[PDB]
Write a protein that binds this ligand. Structure first.
Ligand code: HEM
Ligand code: HEM
Ligand SMILES: Cc1cc(N)nc2cc(-c3ccc(CCN)cc3)ccc12
Ligand SMILES: Cc1cc(N)nc2cc(-c3ccc(CCN)cc3)ccc12
Ligand SMILES: C[C@H](O)[C@H](O)[C@H]1CNc2nc(N)[nH]c(=O)c2N1
Ligand SMILES: C[C@H](O)[C@H](O)[C@H]1CNc2nc(N)[nH]c(=O)c2N1
Ligand SMILES: [Zn+2]
Lengths: 411, 407
């Protein structure tokens, strides 16, 4: 079966066959679409088919399908599963798997870069202190003094689910949020719950508006431990505006390195529950979502006031005007400090090129329109008019429940 | 099977049961989501009629009543006899109002129950069609105090006698090609503008030329009709702060009246059913003016604002887009023509969603089309999970007439 997608702005039509190689479910049925729903222990029984599928993928990509090297690897993995109940990936397979998990991330607009991922093998790690050292080196490598480099660090895989490696932070670098007694919030409201956990674990909070949170790290199923990222490793950009000299007086800054640390990496049936990864920001992630979401820093009105906008009715689009100025300021600040950032026009244009390339060379590119389209100025970017197909390929990055809900506390 | 939708801005959770009443199919499977794809006899007719009449008589609390059973019997007889059936006026109004209520792509559904339905099923000719359409335009326009309306022409019989309005909207600006290169007028309508001249029209080859109507009655060849100019309410577009904005020479019409969809009720098909409401500001300023495949005056506005168009990272396209949209709302408001901005409409839709979950058990909603084409995440619909499913009565797409019409 073949499936066509149409770009309505250029009439380019593309044909997807890669969706046939899809395995997992989407949540949709023939009678309901859950395309806008945010989020819609494993035995030897089902593991070797999952391994064999991955290994067939891997050796196809290295043009060794059906080789002796291929069959011997299958046989070796077979004996390892039946004997030890799991198996280990070779370094080659792990690198391939992590790159293809990003390549298959249907919600990621930055996947033109998928093949330039630096993979850090931390599968020899055994303790929370060892995890912190690996994460510090990831942060330093990835940051590269503002010339950001994509990277992933991979901690040991799940075994019986009772010994997981977990990073309890959702991102490696994030600002604390503090609920005040008067109902207001100091800092980042998205991080109030995590901040409270950290304080409960003994973190001495500075209680400022831009406090970098400590790392809460869990090795081999033990209780998590706090570590402070050395401040010299946390690159930050003060936010100023190219025309408005009062914008600096807002006292805003952001960190340069987006590094998501709460997702699960799946490769050949193995589950890597601790696998922080990082790229560089698209400007709107900071300027639209991190600053102007009602449930975040919510500086729209303060910017709108300082601009002396008509804030009396929404039809003055004072909210839209303030939003664009904030996003100009975020991009100006980052470029001025020579810290890698991409605007949402450049990023979506590149993604369209990536997508067309993927259709030609790979026969498809799974893509989640609901997430690919930028959160402002959607239709003046070229992804808005691009039909997309969403389906789940493996290797993949998956969601996982927050560890404080599932962890069994030692004490 | 009793599904949940979360709003991530407020944590409000709603439980959907209405989807279990979904009949048609979505295009998605458990292996692939197609949520971003734009497009999808005597037997099956009586179950269709029964399901619809069961809906209708429940809504008036007459389910399993004398009137209900007799009507089902009456319709069943007329189907066995005539192979089709006719809707009572009350059923026709209900079916039309619920087709809008079910339109998962429509952000303006909070108004669904206040739809003025014009029964045009006695129409027999394109001249009659033109008359009914003129009365529709004047009623809906209402000197700028716009009123929602639908006019329903005779239902399809055997596909040979279809009533069709060939325009995609009752009021749209012409689109002419070029010996030069690109396009004068509206590029969206280039093909239709051809099939007007190629069908007889005399184009004034300007930029804001209101297209004639191309009306097809009882499956005959379509006929050209010019909509009386004094019924086409238009708004000159100025900006409340830029006075070179007027020099751009822009205007738009006040009445959005979509005329190419098909209205399905109780199995019956109405191929000509033009319906109208009033604009959300972004439909004109974001899409009609700024899409590359449309008027595309973005590059020209930004020049006039002396913005740095050398790098995309200056966000000049974004700054200009906002100003164009401020000007569209300003113009319509100044001329006392009904318009809604995308913040108010999406806020209204969240309240409508909450009402539908409360009093109906759900609301089919297409996030890809509900979220506005600018400033998406500062509107409340962005953070609202939606469930998309196809209820009936419904509005549906239909093929373009010229690709079908046995000439
Ligand atoms: C290199 C620059 C990159 C850019 C500019 C970029 C951009 C983005 C953006 C804007 C999102 C949407 C997040 C949101 O707005 O809430 C996203 C999602 C995502 N990105 Fe990328 N990304 C980059 C690199 C990477 C890398 C290196 C990985 C993994 C190795 C990755 C994996 C993902 C995944 C899995 C998601 C989906 C998360 C989810 O399902 O919630 N990205 N990306
Ligand atoms: C009264 C004010 C109304 C507003 C503000 C409104 C708003 C909108 C908007 C913004 C869209 C997206 C369309 C696009 O982007 O091209 C839409 C779609 C739609 N509207 Fe409404 N609308 C209104 C009235 C109505 C009425 C009266 C009907 C039917 C009786 C209707 C039926 C539809 C349908 C069927 C669609 C989707 C068409 C498709 O699937 O392509 N609307 N509406
Ligand atoms: C690697 C990478 C780079 C980047 N610029 N943004 C990301 C954004 C995400 C992401 C962050 C948060 C969320 C949910 C909250 N918006 C979903 C996805 C994950 C990874 C990213
Ligand atoms: C009744 C009504 C009012 C309004 N403000 N916009 C509409 C917009 C549409 C609409 C028209 C055309 C299309 C084609 C897809 N771009 C999609 C939706 C239909 C009816 C509308
Ligand atoms: C409910 C809705 O799906 C949810 O708010 C999604 C929409 N699209 C998104 N797109 C991006 N890039 N990031 C997001 O957090 C979201 N949130
Ligand atoms: C490709 C994509 O499905 C297409 O551009 C859709 C997306 N969302 C839309 N949303 C609205 N309201 N109107 C549209 O025309 C579209 N176009
Ligand atoms: Zn779907």
């Amino acid at each position: 079966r073949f499936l066509k997608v149409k770009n309505w702005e250029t009439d380019v039509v593309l044909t997807d066959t890669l969706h046939l190689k899809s395995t997992l479910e989407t949540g949709c049925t023939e009678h309901i679409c859950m395309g806008s729903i945010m989020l819609p222990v494993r035995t030897k029984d089902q593991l070797f088919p999952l391994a064999k599928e991955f290994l067939d993928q891997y050796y196809s990509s290295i043009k060794r399908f059906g080789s002796k090297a291929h069959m011997d690897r299958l046989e070796e993995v077979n004996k390892e599963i039946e004997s030890t109940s799991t198996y280990q990936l070779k370094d080659t397979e792990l690198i391939y798997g992590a790159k293809h998990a990003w390549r298959n991330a249907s919600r990621c607009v930055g996947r033109i870069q998928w093949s330039k991922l630096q993979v850090f093998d931390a599968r020899d790690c055994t303790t929370a202190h060892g995890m912190f050292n690996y994460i510090c080196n990831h942060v330093k490598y990835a940051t590269n003094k503002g010339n950001l480099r994509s990277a992933i660090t991979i901690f040991p895989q799940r075994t019986d689910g009772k010994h997981d490696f977990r990073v309890w932070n959702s991102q490696l670098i994030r600002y604390a949020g503090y609920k005040q007694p008067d109902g207001s919030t100091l800092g980042d409201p998205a991080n109030v719950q995590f901040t409270e956990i950290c304080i409960q674990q003994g973190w001495k909070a500075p209680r400022g508006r831009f406090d970098v949170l400590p790392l809460l790290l869990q090795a081999n199923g033990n209780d998590p431990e706090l570590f402070q990222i050395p401040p010299e490793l946390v690159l930050e950009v003060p936010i100023r505006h190219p025309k408005f000299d009062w914008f600096k007086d807002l006292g805003l800054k952001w960190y340069g390195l987006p590094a998501v640390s709460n997702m699960l990496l799946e490769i050949g049936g193995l589950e890597f529950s601790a696998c922080p990864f990082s790229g560089w920001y698209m400007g709107t992630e900071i300027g639209v979502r991190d600053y102007c979401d009602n449930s975040r820093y919510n500086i729209l009105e303060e910017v709108a006031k300082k601009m002396d906008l008509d804030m009396r009715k929404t039809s003055s689009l004072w909210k839209d005007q303030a939003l664009v100025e904030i996003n100009i300021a975020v991009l100006y600040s980052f470029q001025s400090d020579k810290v890698t950032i991409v605007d949402h026009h450049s990023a979506t244009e590149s993604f369209i090129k990536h997508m067309e390339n993927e259709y030609r060379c790979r026969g498809g590119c799974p893509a989640d329109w609901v997430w690919i389209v930028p959160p402002m100025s959607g239709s003046i970017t070229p992804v808005f008019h691009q039909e997309m197909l969403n389906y789940r390929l493996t290797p993949s990055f998956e969601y996982q429940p927050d560890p404080w809900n599932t962890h069994v506390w030692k004490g």
